[PDB]
Amino acid sequence: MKKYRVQPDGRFELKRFDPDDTSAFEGGKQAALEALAVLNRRLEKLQELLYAEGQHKVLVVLQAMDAGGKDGTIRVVFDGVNPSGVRVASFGVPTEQELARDYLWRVHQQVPRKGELVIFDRSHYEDVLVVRVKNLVPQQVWQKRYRHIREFERMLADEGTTILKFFLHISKDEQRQRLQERLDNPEKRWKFRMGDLEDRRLWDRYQEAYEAAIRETSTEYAPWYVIPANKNWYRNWLVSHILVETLEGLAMQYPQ
Amino acid sequence: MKKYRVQPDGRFELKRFDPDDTSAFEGGKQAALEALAVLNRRLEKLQELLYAEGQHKVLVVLQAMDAGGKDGTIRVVFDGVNPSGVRVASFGVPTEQELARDYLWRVHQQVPRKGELVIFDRSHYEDVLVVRVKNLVPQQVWQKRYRHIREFERMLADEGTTILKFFLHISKDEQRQRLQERLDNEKRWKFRMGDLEDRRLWDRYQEAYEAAIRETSTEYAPWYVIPANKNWYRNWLVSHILVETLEGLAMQYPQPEIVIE
Amino acid sequence: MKKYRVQPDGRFELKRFDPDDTSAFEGGKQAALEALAVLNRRLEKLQELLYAEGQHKVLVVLQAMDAGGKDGTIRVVFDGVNPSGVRVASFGVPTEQELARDYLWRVHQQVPRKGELVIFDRSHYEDVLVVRVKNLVPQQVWQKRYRHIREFERMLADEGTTILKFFLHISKDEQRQRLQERLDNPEKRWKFRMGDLEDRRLWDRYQEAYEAAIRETSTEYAPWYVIPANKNWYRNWLVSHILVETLEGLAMQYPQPIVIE
Amino acid sequence: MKKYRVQPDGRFELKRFDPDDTSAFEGGKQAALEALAVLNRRLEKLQELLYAEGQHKVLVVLQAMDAGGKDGTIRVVFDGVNPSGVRVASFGVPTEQELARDYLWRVHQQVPRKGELVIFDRSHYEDVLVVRVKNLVPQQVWQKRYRHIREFERMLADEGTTILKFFLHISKDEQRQRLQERLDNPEKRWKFRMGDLEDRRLWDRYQEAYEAAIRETSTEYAPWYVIPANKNWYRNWLVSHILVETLEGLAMQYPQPETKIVIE
Numbered sequence A: 001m002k003k004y005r006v007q008p009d010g011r012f013e014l015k016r017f018d019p020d021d022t023s024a025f026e027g028g029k030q031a032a033l034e035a036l037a038v039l040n041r042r043l044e045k046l047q048e049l050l051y052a053e054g055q056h057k058v059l060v061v062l063q064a065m066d067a068g069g070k071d072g073t074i075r076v077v078f079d080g081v082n083p084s085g086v087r088v089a090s091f092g093v094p095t096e097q098e099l100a101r102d103y104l105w106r107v108h109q110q111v112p113r114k115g116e117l118v119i120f121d122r123s124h125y126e127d128v129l130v131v132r133v134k135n136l137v138p139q140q141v142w143q144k145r146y147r148h149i150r151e152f153e154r155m156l157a158d159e160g161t162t163i164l165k166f167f168l169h170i171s172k173d174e175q176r177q178r179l180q181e182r183l184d185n186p187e188k189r190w191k192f193r194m195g196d197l198e199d200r201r202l203w204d205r206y207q208e209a210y211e212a213a214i215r216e217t218s219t220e221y222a223p224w225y226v227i228p229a230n231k232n233w234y235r236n237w238l239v240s241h242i243l244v245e246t247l248e249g250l251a252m253q254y255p256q
Numbered sequence B: 001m002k003k004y005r006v007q008p009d010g011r012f013e014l015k016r017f018d019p020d021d022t023s024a025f026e027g028g029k030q031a032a033l034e035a036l037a038v039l040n041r042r043l044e045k046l047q048e049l050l051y052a053e054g055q056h057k058v059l060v061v062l063q064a065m066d067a068g069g070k071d072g073t074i075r076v077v078f079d080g081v082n083p084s085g086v087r088v089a090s091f092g093v094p095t096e097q098e099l100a101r102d103y104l105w106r107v108h109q110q111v112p113r114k115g116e117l118v119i120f121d122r123s124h125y126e127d128v129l130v131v132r133v134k135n136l137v138p139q140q141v142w143q144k145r146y147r148h149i150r151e152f153e154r155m156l157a158d159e160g161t162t163i164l165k166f167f168l169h170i171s172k173d174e175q176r177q178r179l180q181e182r183l184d185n186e187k188r189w190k191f192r193m194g195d196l197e198d199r200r201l202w203d204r205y206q207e208a209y210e211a212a213i214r215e216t217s218t219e220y221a222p223w224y225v226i227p228a229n230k231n232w233y234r235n236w237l238v239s240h241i242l243v244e245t246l247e248g249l250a251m252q253y254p255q256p257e258i259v260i261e
Numbered sequence C: 001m002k003k004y005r006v007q008p009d010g011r012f013e014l015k016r017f018d019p020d021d022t023s024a025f026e027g028g029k030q031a032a033l034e035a036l037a038v039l040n041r042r043l044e045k046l047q048e049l050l051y052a053e054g055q056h057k058v059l060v061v062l063q064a065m066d067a068g069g070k071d072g073t074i075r076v077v078f079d080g081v082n083p084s085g086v087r088v089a090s091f092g093v094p095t096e097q098e099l100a101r102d103y104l105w106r107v108h109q110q111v112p113r114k115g116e117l118v119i120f121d122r123s124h125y126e127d128v129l130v131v132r133v134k135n136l137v138p139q140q141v142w143q144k145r146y147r148h149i150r151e152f153e154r155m156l157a158d159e160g161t162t163i164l165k166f167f168l169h170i171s172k173d174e175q176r177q178r179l180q181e182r183l184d185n186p187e188k189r190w191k192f193r194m195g196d197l198e199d200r201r202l203w204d205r206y207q208e209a210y211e212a213a214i215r216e217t218s219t220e221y222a223p224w225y226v227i228p229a230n231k232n233w234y235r236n237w238l239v240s241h242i243l244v245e246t247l248e249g250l251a252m253q254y255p256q257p258i259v260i261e
Numbered sequence D: 001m002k003k004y005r006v007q008p009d010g011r012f013e014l015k016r017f018d019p020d021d022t023s024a025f026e027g028g029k030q031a032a033l034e035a036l037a038v039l040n041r042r043l044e045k046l047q048e049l050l051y052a053e054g055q056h057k058v059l060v061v062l063q064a065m066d067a068g069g070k071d072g073t074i075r076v077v078f079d080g081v082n083p084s085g086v087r088v089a090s091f092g093v094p095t096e097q098e099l100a101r102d103y104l105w106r107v108h109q110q111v112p113r114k115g116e117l118v119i120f121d122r123s124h125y126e127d128v129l130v131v132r133v134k135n136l137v138p139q140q141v142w143q144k145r146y147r148h149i150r151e152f153e154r155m156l157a158d159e160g161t162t163i164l165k166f167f168l169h170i171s172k173d174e175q176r177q178r179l180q181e182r183l184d185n186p187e188k189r190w191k192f193r194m195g196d197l198e199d200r201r202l203w204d205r206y207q208e209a210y211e212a213a214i215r216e217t218s219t220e221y222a223p224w225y226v227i228p229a230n231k232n233w234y235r236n237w238l239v240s241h242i243l244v245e246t247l248e249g250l251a252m253q254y255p256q257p258e259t260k261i262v263i264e
């Protein structure tokens, strides 16, 4: 339900959300997997509607601590959706070309067009996250970006983009296990890079940056949802539920 | 299977391929779906390898007569593939922006990067198909493009791109039936009036497809003629050809350079 | 002389600016040409500094009624500037690709990078100008865009873009002569577009739209300048003066730092 | 005018071109400057036709040894050209995003459109130059690229692009002065890199790559011109002459009006 939408009152505190919380689903993994299968099928039908109607633009932003489940959320929640109408835009270390323009330039280029659903795998929020945590620009610079982001998203929404932002929220010990497993798994070693450790040493700074970002930019037109993500089955189910409910609210119809 | 690969001998004749041929699968519809499901899961694992290895580029080109099943092929063959590694680039009627540059400009911009598999829903070949059939440029112009394409694809492959080109081959009457289907129903939005103009030109299109295939099917960028009158056979055959191709790359997960605290 | 900078008090009135005003220059065309040549030489040197320092981004927006002199301003004001560091981005009728995204998508793509000076030949302001005058989207939509533009420009400025916006202001009788000239000159007829006459019939609505846009979006970090433009020599001189002074105000420095055998 | 167009016979030899050659212009520095001014103004006027006609695409390639004068040529040759029709595309060290595609991806994106003149400040040729000299890919890789480039440029020309490729040819001792003068000038030190020295130490391997590239890719649809570039006034004059005449050969026309009538 909507106990996970962050209200636009600037009173948000990340400690009020428990990464192991599963209270929204009355059951465990096995029943959730079945309910996910039902939601996934509705998602597929709604996506085909979105694409066919060709009017709405849908933007899903995914942010998380490292190993917080971004890849799994993309892979599982959107399984079976027509590839012609869903696109993943990943944002990594900015290139020199990208740093030569404002930080929103490379992000604005990737926004979804009419009839399209786009997933931001990481996003412009990295410019008030990692950029803040590692002081890649002075605080006086990034402090102003919360306003930039609110106004950029307001413009997107005003012009027809439905915006969903999900913070996949895992605990510190959960990250330790996933990072270790990533080491203890030959098919996952490629995902692990030593830089992952340095980011972990800053666990508390990142959590502070995430709370500030979420408090500052969760709006009626661009809400943040905090997703307890220690349980993959719960994470996938809750994201699917919110996404499906949002898409249903658009009242999309096939053209005559 | 390889009897469906157009050899680079310039002696391709499209009549030597039956739109209803299914001789490559020993069974019927139901047995094929079982093998297709097996191939699909094979496809998924190979995509995750491709993405993880981050070395090869894979370009799948889809061409067919209208209603020849390209949209269905994309939706069925790549069901369940991780969206982060599979991308569809569709090419429609060129804009003024795209016509102000060479015809390959808009196509080159969309090629797959390392670790990525890209589906061309239509391709640069439209510039030696519809462009030729409707004489949108003089033959003196487009007849040169067979070489451009051979060389453009040669450069892509030399630099690491695996190229598969599939012609989904249906019969004319089969087309009529499917077109009539499009009018009857949730799909009416897909139907176009220009489609009829193209239908009367069925023969000029078949000739262009044979010419393009004869001219541009190469060792580094082969054409496969896919009997596509049967969707279950079409999907199975394309899946089989692709999976073999990905298997031939012998891809391996990379390697690393210890206890997390 | 910042008598032409529109202050950010939302009080701007277009009627208080006379297109024939030349009061800022004590002289006429011949003396202005000499002052322009002096300013142009400084501009060329400041541009080389901008490029060499590689930190600031400079955006010059040009808007005007049709035949209001934007092409002439570009040609004359930027005569002799190194092509490696200045670039014109012109905005015409949005394509379907561009209309499928928010109106700022196609504009953001063209903003200047570090060390570069970009001229917007027309700009995002068309989306509260022609779009407003001809109701290309409902008033409920475009009325919201003044805020979008204020915040878009604020973000650009916060992140290092110096923004100058020039409204080249000609009178209605002046536009009649210049349009009539474009018809009577074989070297300019191609510039004449039949839509221009429709736009002329709406002269008053465009003036209203320009007044609203300028009142709504002239801010400290992104000022509008109203340029009396009936006199080309005065227009070119005044734009050069404002541009040069702005660039001088940035106080740009060449970057910091053995024999060759 | 005729003697600087590398013939498409694959026997091109660089040592048969003198960086100090000025034999194409009858005069000295001052007489060339006057002719350069005359060519410059025709260039301005021809560009306005190109832009207005909106049919032809014009691509000017500039390659040179470091400090060989590519920046100066752009600054001088195109001084006074309307920015609305002339665009410079610079190519530096590829980003990871650009390396994830074939080396021609980032270059093809920048080709000129109809009515436009584009200057490639460095180009796709760097992928058989610095890439070859420093073995950024195995010779097995970059050896195939001469073919790629001939065919890429053939496609461009067939589809309406006029291609001019200029190698600005300076001597090893001449480069030494410009690099030195680059240090001895507070307004130019920013241009000097230490990598400039490591590339200078490889002068001969670079010269060999240029001869190979020029011999392999000079064709009748995409000619290379070797420009004696030790003297700036001659370099600027010669490049201007070749460019202007080529533009004259296009026989560009102002369009016909839309459709005598009166304005109210």
Ligand SMILES: Nc1ncnc2c1ncn2[C@@H]1O[C@H](COP(=O)(O)OP(=O)(O)OP(=O)(O)O)[C@@H](O)[C@H]1O
Binding pocket: A066, A067, A090, A091, A092, A093, A094, A122, A126, A127, A130, A131
């Ligand atoms: N604006 C930014 N400034 C600096 N670093 C950034 C920015 N945006 C993204 N990054 C960083 O880019 C890094 C790598 O992203 P990339 O997708 O290229 O690699 P990856 O191995 O797939 O990582 P992941 O799956 O965690 O995104 C991340 O650590 C992220 O913090």
Ligand SMILES: Nc1ncnc2c1ncn2[C@@H]1O[C@H](COP(=O)(O)OP(=O)(O)OP(=O)(O)O)[C@@H](O)[C@H]1O
Binding pocket: B066, B071, B090, B091, B092, B093, B094, B122, B126, B127, B130, B131, B190, B192
């Ligand atoms: N280079 C080209 N020049 C002219 N027409 C082209 C070109 N490329 C594709 N086309 C034509 O444009 C149409 C494809 O446009 P688009 O992708 O918008 O179609 P659609 O309505 O989605 O359906 P479909 O693509 O399946 O036919 C086809 O009729 C094709 O022949």
Ligand SMILES: Nc1ncnc2c1ncn2[C@@H]1O[C@H](COP(=O)(O)OP(=O)(O)OP(=O)(O)O)[C@@H](O)[C@H]1O
Binding pocket: C066, C090, C091, C092, C093, C094, C122, C126, C127, C130, C131, C191, C193, C195
């Ligand atoms: N956002 C927009 N919405 C609608 N029309 C627009 C928009 N932006 C620009 N235009 C229109 O585009 C036209 C300019 O087109 P373009 O620049 O391609 O041609 P042009 O002949 O050079 O015209 P001009 O010299 O007046 O700019 C103008 O009529 C202008 O009103």
Ligand SMILES: Nc1ncnc2c1ncn2[C@@H]1O[C@H](COP(=O)(O)OP(=O)(O)OP(=O)(O)O)[C@@H](O)[C@H]1O
Binding pocket: D066, D071, D090, D091, D092, D093, D094, D121, D122, D126, D127, D130, D131
């Ligand atoms: N394909 C390529 N592979 C490797 N290096 C390349 C490639 N293309 C260009 N470069 C190199 O990029 C370097 C930097 O050029 P850049 O345009 O970024 O800036 P610059 O300092 O102004 O250089 P310059 O004035 O010498 O052109 C040059 O040394 C050039 O050789």
